Amino acid sequence: SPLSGSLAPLNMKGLVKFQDVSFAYPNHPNVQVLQGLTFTLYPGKVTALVGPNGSGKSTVAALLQNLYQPTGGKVLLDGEPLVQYDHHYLHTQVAAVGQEPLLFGRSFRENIAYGLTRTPTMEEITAVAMESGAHDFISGFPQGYDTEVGETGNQLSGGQRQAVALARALIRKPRLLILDQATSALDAGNQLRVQRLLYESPEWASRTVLLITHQLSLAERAHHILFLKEGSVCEQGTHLQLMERGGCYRSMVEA
Amino acid sequence: SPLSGSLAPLNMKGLVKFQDVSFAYPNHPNVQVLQGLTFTLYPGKVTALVGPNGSGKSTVAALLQNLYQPTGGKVLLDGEPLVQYDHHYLHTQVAAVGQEPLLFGRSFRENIAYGLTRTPTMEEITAVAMESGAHDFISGFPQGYDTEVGETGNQLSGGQRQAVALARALIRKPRLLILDQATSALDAGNQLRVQRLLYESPEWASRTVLLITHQLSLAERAHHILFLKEGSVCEQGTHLQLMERGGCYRSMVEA
Numbered sequence: 388s389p390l391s392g393s394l395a396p397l398n399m400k401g402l403v404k405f406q407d408v409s410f411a412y413p414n415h416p417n418v419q420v421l422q423g424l425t426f427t428l429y430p431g432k433v434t435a436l437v438g439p440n441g442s443g444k445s446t447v448a449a450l451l452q453n454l455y456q457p458t459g460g461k462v463l464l465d466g467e468p469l470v471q472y473d474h475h476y477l478h479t480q481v482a483a484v485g486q487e488p489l490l491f492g493r494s495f496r497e498n499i500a501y502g503l504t505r506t507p508t509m510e511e512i513t514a515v516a517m518e519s520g521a522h523d524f525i526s527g528f529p530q531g532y533d534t535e536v537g538e539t540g541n542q543l544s545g546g547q548r549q550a551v552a553l554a555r556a557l558i559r560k561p562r563l564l565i566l567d568q569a570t571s572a573l574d575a576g577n578q579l580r581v582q583r584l585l586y587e588s589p590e591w592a593s594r595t596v597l598l599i600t601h602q603l604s605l606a607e608r609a610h611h612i613l614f615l616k617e618g619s620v621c622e623q624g625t626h627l628q629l630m631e632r633g634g635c636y637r638s639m640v641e642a
Numbered sequence: 643s644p645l646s647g648s649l650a651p652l653n654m655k656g657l658v659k660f661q662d663v664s665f666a667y668p669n670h671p672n673v674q675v676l677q678g679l680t681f682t683l684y685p686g687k688v689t690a691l692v693g694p695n696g697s698g699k700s701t702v703a704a705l706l707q708n709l710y711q712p713t714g715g716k717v718l719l720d721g722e723p724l725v726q727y728d729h730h731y732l733h734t735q736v737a738a739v740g741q742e743p744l745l746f747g748r749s750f751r752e753n754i755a756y757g758l759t760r761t762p763t764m765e766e767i768t769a770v771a772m773e774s775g776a777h778d779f780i781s782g783f784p785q786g787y788d789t790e791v792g793e794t795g796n797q798l799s800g801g802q803r804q805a806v807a808l809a810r811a812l813i814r815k816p817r818l819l820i821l822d823q824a825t826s827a828l829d830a831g832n833q834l835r836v837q838r839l840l841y842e843s844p845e846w847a848s849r850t851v852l853l854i855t856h857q858l859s860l861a862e863r864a865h866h867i868l869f870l871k872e873g874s875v876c877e878q879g880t881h882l883q884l885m886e887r888g889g890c891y892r893s894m895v896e897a
């Protein structure tokens with residue numbers, strides 16, 4: 388293992404390549420989850436990852452954060468195996484959002500800013516919270532952003548939780564953003580604003596975004612769509628292209 | 643409160659009325675969540691409940707199970723205040739599904755059959771699992787339906803968990819079924835199958851269904867739609883009716 392965790396380049400393009408990737412979970416090694424899995428995530432694109440329940444979408448998200456390593460094949464980040472990047476470095480360059488709980492006992496400000504090397508200003512905190520749809524509800528609390536998450540049993544609403552978790556990932560400005568059904572709890576207005584940010588803002592134009600979703604309307608807007616079935620990409624392309632093909636994606640839109 | 647918890651009738655139509663309902667959570671009593679809230683849920687209808695983040699949709703679901711009581715106004719079930727029904731009786735007649743975890747250390751069969759008065763046959767267990775999309779993956783395990791949930795750290799996929807939780811609610815055959823964003827984790831095929839069950843099957847035809855969702859395509863199919871804003875129903879009717887109305891729902895659809 389001499390090259391393991393050795394890389395932390397100052398510049399990172401965020402070009403991701405899965406190359407003939409297979410995977411089974413270490414503690415369940417005799418059930419194949421990903422197999423012959425090959426795709427490229429290009430910076431400047433939002434790539435949507437879609438497919439049936441259990442097809443392997445969240446597993447792909449896990450491998451992209453080096454939470455696990457491929458059992459076969461290669462996961463490359465700018466041409467180098469992901470395992471050769473420093474643990475803390477990958478944390479700074481790759482941010483993933485799912486449906487996880489917030490950090491109880493810490494403030495909303497802390498929750499948004501958690502894990503940063505720098506201390507963002509309140510202007511910066513408020514700016515990102517306005518994008519995710521978290522600013523209005525936080526500003527309605529008597530202690531504002533200094534309000535404690537989980538205070539006196541208040542669990543927040545699902546979409547409110549999601550808006551805070553999104554702001555946390557957004558303010559990090561990662562080279563690779565992974566949204567694992569991170570907007571399914573957001574309302575129409577909030578979902579629309581987050582999408583505008585990713586598709587229109589200058590800062591996201593150079594970054595790599597993976598959008599995992601069962602929502603057709605989000606998939607339809609992506610620059611590229613990967614259809615994952617039984618741990619492999621059986622078809623891919625734009626919405627229009629996949630509709631012409633009349634395969635699994637078309638059948639998903641029809642259903 | 644001599645009438646509190648006293649009712650347990652054999653015949654339950656499932657007609658639900660909120661009448662001028664207000665609510666604040668007991669530990670946060672000075673933040674109003676629901677206010678001037680009036681609607682009816684009729685048996686034989688799927689009623690969709692839609693609205694922005696934090697509008698009070700899950701709170702309504704909680705009040706429908708008598709997990710909390712209204713601070714003002716009335717929650718009637720077949721004309722009688724909900725507080726007047728026996729705690730266990732309501733458990734048998736009202737089932738709610740959300741994104742909650744499964745029961746770890748119990749089998750899949752146990753998870754589906756949990757809390758039932760009777761012991762369902764395997765034909766009955768597999769039938770419901772087939773409707774929710776759980777049968778195929780469960781049937782792939784070496785001990786099948788007798789496989790332990792959470793075995794050796796396997797937490798399943800999000801959609802797989804949701805399919806199990808759905809099967810548990812469906813097999814109870816409650817008079818009132820509450821789906822709190824219970825199908826957003828399900829793939830297209832599974833979502834469609836569940837909808838066919840609710841809209842087409844004879845058993846669900848006499849039952850009351852509340853479908854809480856941010857997915858417009860699901861709302862559009864509903865027999866009635868409630869648009870919740872700031873804890874109050876500001877408009878309601880069919881999709882076509884609300885589209886002709888030209889208010890908040892139409893704006894959401896066109897957004």
Ligand SMILES: Nc1ncnc2c1ncn2[C@@H]1O[C@H](COP(=O)(O)OP(=O)(O)OP(=O)(O)O)[C@@H](O)[C@H]1O
Nearest residue numbers: 541543544545546547667695696697698699700701
């Ligand atoms: N246990 C609680 N204690 C105090 N306040 C709560 C609690 N649960 C929810 N709330 C608050 O009540 C309001 C309504 O929340 P609810 O979860 O009902 O909204 P919702 O319409 O389901 O939201 P979303 O669409 O984001 O899921 C929110 O402002 C929320 O923070």
Ligand SMILES: Nc1ncnc2c1ncn2[C@@H]1O[C@H](COP(=O)(O)OP(=O)(O)OP(=O)(O)O)[C@@H](O)[C@H]1O
Nearest residue numbers: 412440441442443444445446796798799800801802
């Ligand atoms: N920690 C784990 N250990 C063992 N197996 C797992 C683990 N997590 C997921 N799996 C299995 O791997 C397969 C892929 O799961 P994954 O969560 O990647 O699918 P998904 O495409 O995101 O599913 P969904 O659309 O249902 O959310 C499933 O069969 C699942 O049960």
Ligand SMILES: [Mg+2]
Nearest residue numbers: 445799800801
């Ligand atoms: Mg998943």
Ligand SMILES: [Mg+2]
Nearest residue numbers: 544545699700
């Ligand atoms: Mg909710």
